[PDB]
Amino acid sequence: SVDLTVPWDDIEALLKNNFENDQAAVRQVMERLQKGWSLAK
Amino acid sequence: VDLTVPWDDIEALLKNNFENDQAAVRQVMERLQKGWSLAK
């Protein structure tokens, strides 16, 4: 049931660029966005 | 809502992905930001 139709992979590529290729930051933001998506619906 | 997250750039990406559908972009931006503020 985990959401797959938001373009998560494209969002991740955007975030990796924005955060200067900081993997830890990308992981933190992707985790919270996807957790939040589930909690908000 | 943490403004270090590049919400405007995410919106531009969604607009392309959803064929410029305003309603879809709104739906997704609403839920992403509601979820961000809820989630820790």
For this entry, resolution in Å reads 1.2
The separation between the first and the last C-alpha atoms of chain B, rounded to the nearest angstrom, is: 11
Work out how many domains chain A is built from and give that number: 1
Chain breaks in chain B (C to N over 2.5 A) after: none
Task: Give Cα B27 to chain centroid, integer Å.
Answer: 8
Residue A36 near residue B32, CB atoms below 8 Å? yes
Identify the residue whose tokens are 């531009």: B12
Please answer yes or no on whether A39 and B37 come within 8 Å at the CB atom: no
- Segments forming the whole domain that contains residue A7: 1-41
Rg (CA), chain A: 11
For residue A19, give the CATH number of its domain. 1.10.286.70
Q: Indicate yes or no: CB of B39 within 8 angstroms of CB of A41.
A: no
Contacts of A38 in chain B (CB under 8 A): 35
Question: What angle separates helix B22-38 from helix B7-17, to the nearest 10 degrees?
Answer: 140
- Beta-carbon contacts of residue B5 (< 8 Å; ≥ 6 apart): A29, B36
Task: List the helix and strand counts (H, then E) for chain B.
Answer: 2, 0
Q: Which candidate, A2, A21, A7, A19, places its Cα nearest to that of B10?
A: A7
